[PDB]
């Protein structure tokens, strides 16, 4: 009903394109392999498929996925809680990630992110 959009196609494309760079040039991503829930095999396997899907998604962006966690990581993606890292062992990669000011995402956050960049996973 009003003729000017809040955000513009190009304005949005700008936001994407900038994130897309960060991804291609600087993003080193670790998928946390520790679970905080004793799911049954079925759901454990469903969560695993989603994880793989995200990996391919980010691969599509030219990000690096390390099988191995260290200080070079920039974003950790996990299925555990993100709000309670403080309760964990200093030893824990989520603790460490926080200690090194790394970015920590849920599977939900990651999915949103990818869709916000027009990566279609269902294909």
From Swiss-Prot:
Induction: Cell cycle-regulated. Protein levels increase as cells begin S phase and remain high through late mitosis. Phosphorylated by CDC7 and by CDC5. It comes from the Eukaryota. Heterodimer with CDC7 to form the DBF4-dependent kinase (DDK) complex. Interacts (via PBD-binding motif) with CDC5 (via POLO box domains). Interacts (via N-terminus) with ORC2, ORC3 and RAD53. Binds to ARS1 origin DNA. Regulatory subunit of the CDC7-DBF4 kinase, also called DBF4-dependent kinase (DDK), which is involved in cell cycle regulation of premitotic and premeiotic chromosome replication and in chromosome segregation. DDK plays an essential role in initiating DNA replication at replication origins by phosphorylating the MCM2 and MCM4 subunits of the MCM2-7 helicase complex. DBF4 recruits the catalytic subunit CDC7 to MCM2 and to origins of replication. DDK also has postreplicative functions in meiosis. This is DDK kinase regulatory subunit DBF4. The gene is DBF4. The chain holds residues 98 to 220 of 704 of the full protein.
């Amino acid at each position: 009903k009003n003729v000017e959009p809040r955000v513009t196609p190009k304005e949005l494309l700008e936001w994407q394109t900038n994130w897309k760079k960060i991804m291609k040039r600087d993003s080193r991503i670790y998928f946390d392999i520790t679970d905080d829930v004793e799911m049954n095999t079925y759901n454990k396997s469903k969560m695993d498929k989603r994880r793989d899907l995200l990996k391919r998604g980010f691969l599509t962006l030219g990000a690096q996925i390390t099988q191995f966690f260290d200080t070079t990581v920039t974003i950790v993606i996990t299925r555990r809680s993100v709000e309670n890292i403080y309760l964990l062992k200093d030893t824990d990669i989520l603790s460490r990630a926080k200690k090194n000011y790394m970015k920590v995402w849920s599977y939900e956050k990651a999915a949103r992110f990818l869709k916000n960049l027009d990566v279609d996973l269902d294909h």
